Amino acid sequence: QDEVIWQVVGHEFCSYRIKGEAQNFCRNEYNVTGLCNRQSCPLANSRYATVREDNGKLYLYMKTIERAHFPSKLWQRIKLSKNYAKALEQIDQQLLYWPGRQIHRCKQRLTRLTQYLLKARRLALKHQPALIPIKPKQAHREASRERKALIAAKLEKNIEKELVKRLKSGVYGDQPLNVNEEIWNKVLAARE
């Protein structure tokens, strides 16, 4: 069984395998380490224990060889206490006389899943900027319409049109301080 299963899945084809350059990973949800190994394969290991998180609560999942052909009842689940010391002892009691490597890998996953929940709670409290996507179509539309808007704006024509307009209305004092004498003389004769 187990050694036949491993040869079929570990070396011919598994739909859960991600082939990386330095290591192979496992897409299985029931893998403690997340790697493709002989010891961490949930399919090839008839007795297997893992820790996974459900809506903020970490559970110990265990399966035995005697439930291998009943997929609905294959994995059993217990609640791990929020107290870390009690959670470690819960894994020790439920995994009693299991190999020390399997208890070791379950306690390692409990630490990483506890840190991730801790980091998830601290991220909620903090105020972080929301990432808003960049839309390639709207950027192209606004860049083109902006170019048309800038050309149609005629900024220099409109700036000098208003600046001369407020010179006529005398928004300054008696005579403005920004105008040369000859220009001011031309303004007075023209406007009157």
Partner: protein, 305 residues
């Protein structure tokens, strides 16, 4: 698209294009001959066949203001959040310019150029985990009137949110086409004189709020001697920010004959309004006074500012 042969339909198109050019030329030469003989047919054609432009064919909205003064509109502006600037109190604007967390050198260059445009406006580097609402409440007790926050990421400034202390409306913009003074051809060196402000084409009611908010950042007693002008121009919902150094002189274009010689000072950028919030800026829990929808901005003839 009836013809499936590329060469044939390229020959068919060219023979139809040539015929279209020819017959339009004949009617244009005939019209010119018959309208130069009788100027009447020339002067009514020009007054009737005015070229169409996006501004002329802009969609109709009743939110636009009228030339005539209306008591209701002027009664609303006499007690709002910007009233402390336009009233007899004449409270000088004290600006606080800050950036997003962990800004880069390039954001400081834009900020330094932006601080030139605003005398009596100081910069404070954004430190740690202080938020905009906390900055606003802390800046209000320090005597500040308007808070400007420059958003930059990937070494590029792309947004600008300005809030009016203590509880005034907060406007969120998106900056584009940022261009410091060094990148502008034939630029000038800005002096310390208070620049004048000219604001154009803010016809809609929402334009008044944004125009008043932008006006409220400038000291209302401009130094005439320095003759520096800062322009905010809203064309097709695009707000163009520019600063020049004018000088009146003789030009042959205007009927009066006087024109100004603008020399750009910088910075040069464009702002697109994205959101107006009633009260201090809280992106999650703010009262949306206005929120731009990209779907209905695809209508090139419809504008909100």
């Amino acid at each position: 698209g009836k013809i499936k042969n590329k060469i044939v339909r390229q020959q068919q198109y060219m023979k139809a294009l040539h015929q279209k050019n020819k017959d339009k030329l004949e009617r244009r030469k005939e019209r010119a001959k018959e309208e130069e003989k009788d100027p009447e047919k020339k002067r009514l054609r020009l007054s009737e066949n005015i070229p169409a432009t996006i501004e002329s064919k802009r969609v109709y909205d009743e939110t636009i203001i009228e030339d005539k003064p209306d008591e209701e509109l002027q009664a609303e502006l006499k007690d709002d959040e910007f009233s402390a600037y336009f009233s007899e109190e004449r409270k000088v604007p004290k600006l606080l310019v800050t950036t997003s967390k962990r800004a880069s050198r390039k954001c400081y260059d834009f900020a330094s150029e932006l601080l030139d445009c605003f005398p009596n406006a100081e910069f404070r580097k954004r430190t740690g985990d202080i938020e905009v609402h906390e900055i606003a409440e802390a800046a209000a007790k320090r005597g500040y009137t308007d808070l400007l926050v420059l958003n930059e990421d990937r070494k590029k400034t792309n947004a600008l949110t300005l809030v009016h202390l203590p509880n005034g409306p907060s406007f969120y913009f998106t900056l584009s086409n940022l261009q410091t003074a060094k990148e502008i051809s034939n630029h000038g060196r800005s002096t310390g004189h208070i620049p004048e402000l000219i604001i154009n084409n803010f016809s809609t009611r929402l334009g008044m709020t944004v125009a008043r908010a932008f006006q409220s950042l400038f000291i209302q007693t401009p130094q005439i001697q320095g003759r520096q002008v800062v322009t905010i121009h809203c064309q097709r919902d695009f707000l163009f920010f520019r600063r020049h150094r004018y000088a009146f002189r003789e030009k042959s274009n205007m009927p009066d004959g006087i024109g100004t010689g603008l020399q750009e000072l910088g910075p040069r950028f464009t702002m697109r309004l994205r959101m107006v919030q009633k009260g201090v800026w809280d992106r999650k829990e703010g009262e949306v006074f206005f929120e731009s929808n990209a779907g209905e901005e695809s209508d090139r003839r419809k504008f909100w500012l």
